[PDB]
Design a protein around this ligand. Structure first.
Ligand SMILES: O=c1ccn([C@@H]2O[C@H](COP(=O)(O)OP(=O)(O)O)[C@@H](O)[C@H]2O)c(=O)[nH]1
Ligand SMILES: [Mn+2]
Length: 535
């Protein structure tokens, strides 16, 4: 066990009589050692309480002779965390969570989900949706289309100049995008004083402001609702996932104010795991390839490890056709002897499960959450966690704490009723006065929050509901803290939380398509398409 109260008394000497903060430490040390409980969260919390009481002392008495022995004890506490999390492991609840909010779910997403279904016939599959918001994506399309045209009519004479910089286009368009969102939101607020749905209001707004037939829009709603209930769909609003008002407001400011489905989705995946436990997966993930499968086929030295994994999938698809119209462009580049060898291997396999791994058992700790990796960094596109896991609750806290930081400076900025430019200067001015050595990177990364999705290089979502929130919660757990903004674990500490590598295929056609590339070059590119399609 941890060292005893009676030997800390020996090692933590001082000429001074026992300070009360040191007495409390002794009491926490005895409480912990003398625990009978086998409840890991209980054990962990008692560890956390002890470690908190050590830090108070060492901060109050920075020169006590007791600090060496209390420092060595903190080192032993850090080791105890790992002992606790490795002490009662078991498999996870056999649920798969997928999420599709915002519009009609694609046939192609349904095809990828069906792969998971077939291989893992004993998992209960849930496809989360929001019955209130099938028209959000449609609305955001219309606003961006109208704004593009507005910006081009305004910039038309300056665009003739060959040294014109497309960034000025993107700033201009975003002003227009902001005003259109604002009008919609104020219209929304005005209609909810009595009890209408988001779709009712989007529908009315589209007919009034964007020349839409209510009957076309209604058919899209009913059809998209039908198609998702026929495919494992389950409505977030009927199962009361949001019990906390704080979290519902976060999901609504993403779903409604910004119209950011990715971010609104990040909230939902965590609540799903918290309430039901199991495995979350983005709809562009595929099951893992059997490990042996292509061991007799050596990767050419000209082809990166990544393309090689992309190729193995294309091979299975070209010969098994699990998914219709799956790209072949990379498999085609191979020398005929490779192609043949792939065809021999694949076409000699009888059943789908001889090709793809099944999850089967996923034996993990009830304290933890496991997560996919990319380039040695975490990425929230696959998740494993037991129902009500502590680390799952920590990630929620991080997200709450991060949005609370954000709205502190943003809400006063928006309530002031200004245009996008004045709103931004007000927002930033406030934001950068909060700056410390602790948070300055986080601050400059959520500074372009309002333009995420509409302008190149806005990636605030990463630091709010995405990986940034996860990386910090992993730090908080290992180091028995709360609410860390920026601090990170070394690679070897991080690795324990990896999603089992062979149980996932992360390099899919859709993953690659749906992957962020709104950099300065694709903005150049996209701008020319706009100028080309102008009238
Ligand atoms: O219109 C959308 C697009 C995104 N998503 C959710 O966000 C996840 C990830 O989106 P995407 O793959 O496009 O983003 P990426 O991870 O590549 O940045 C999807 O699996 C969906 O659950 C959604 O619900 N509606
Ligand atoms: Mn993706």
């Amino acid at each position: 066990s941890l060292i005893s109260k009676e030997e800390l008394i020996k090692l933590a000497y001082s000429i001074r009589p026992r300070e009360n903060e040191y007495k409390t430490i002794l009491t926490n040390l005895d409480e912990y050692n003398k625990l009978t409980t086998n409840n890991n969260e209980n054990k962990y919390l008692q560890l956390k309480k002890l470690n908190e009481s050590i830090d108070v002392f060492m901060n109050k008495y920075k020169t006590s002779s007791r600090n060496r022995a209390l420092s060595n004890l903190k080192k032993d506490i850090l080791k105890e965390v790992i002992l606790i999390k490795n002490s009662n492991t078991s498999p996870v609840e056999k649920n798969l969570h997928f999420v599709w909010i915002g519009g009609e779910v694609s046939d192609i997403a349904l095809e990828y989900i069906k792969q998971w279904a077939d291989i893992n016939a004993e998992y209960n599959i849930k496809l989360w949706y929001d019955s209130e918001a099938f028209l959000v994506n449609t609305l955001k399309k219309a606003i961006v289309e109208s704004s593009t045209t507005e910006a081009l009519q305004l910039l038309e004479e300056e665009i003739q100049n060959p040294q014109f910089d497309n960034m000025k286009f993107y700033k201009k368009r975003m002003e227009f995008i902001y005003d259109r969102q604002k009008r919609f939101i104020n219209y929304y607020k005005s209609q909810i004083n009595k009890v209408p749905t988001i779709d009712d209001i989007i529908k009315s707004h589209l007919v009034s402001e964007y020349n839409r037939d209510e009957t076309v829009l209604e058919s899209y709603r009913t059809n998209s609702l039908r198609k998702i209930n026929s495919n494992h769909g389950i409505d977030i609003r009927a199962n009361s996932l949001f019990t906390e008002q704080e979290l519902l407001n976060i999901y609504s400011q993403e779903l409604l104010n910004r119209g950011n489905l990715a971010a609104a989705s990040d909230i939902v995946r965590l609540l799903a795991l918290k309430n039901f436990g199991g495995v979350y997966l983005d709809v562009d993930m595929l099951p893992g390839i059997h490990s042996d499968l292509f061991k007799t086929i050596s990767r050419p030295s000209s082809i990166g490890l990544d393309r090689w994994e992309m190729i193995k999938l294309e091979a299975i698809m070209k010969y098994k056709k699990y998914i219709n119209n799956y790209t072949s462009e990379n498999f085609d580049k191979l020398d005929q002897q490779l192609k043949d060898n792939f065809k021999l291997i694949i076409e000699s396999k009888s059943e789908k499960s001889e090709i793809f791994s099944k999850l089967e058992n996923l034996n993990v700790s009830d304290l933890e959450i496991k997560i996919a990796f990319a380039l040695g960094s975490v990425i929230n596109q696959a998740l494993i966690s037991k129902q009500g896991s502590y680390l799952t609750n920590l990630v929620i806290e991080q997200v709450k704490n991060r949005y609370q930081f954000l709205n502190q400076h943003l809400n006063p900025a928006i309530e002031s009723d200004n245009n996008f430019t004045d709103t931004t200067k007000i927002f930033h001015d406030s934001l950068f006065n909060s700056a410390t050595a602790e948070n300055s990177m986080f601050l400059t990364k959520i500074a372009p929050y309002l333009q995420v999705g509409f302008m190149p290089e806005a990636r605030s979502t990463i630091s709010l509901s995405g990986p940034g929130a996860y990386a910090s919660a992993y730090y908080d757990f290992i180091n028995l803290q709360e609410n860390t903004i920026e601090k990170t674990l070394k690679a070897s500490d991080l690795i324990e939380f990896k999603f089992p590598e062979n149980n996932l295929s992360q390099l899919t056609e859709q993953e690659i398509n749906s992957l962020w590339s709104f950099d300065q070059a694709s903005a150049k590119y996209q701008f020319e398409k706009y100028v080309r399609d102008y009238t």
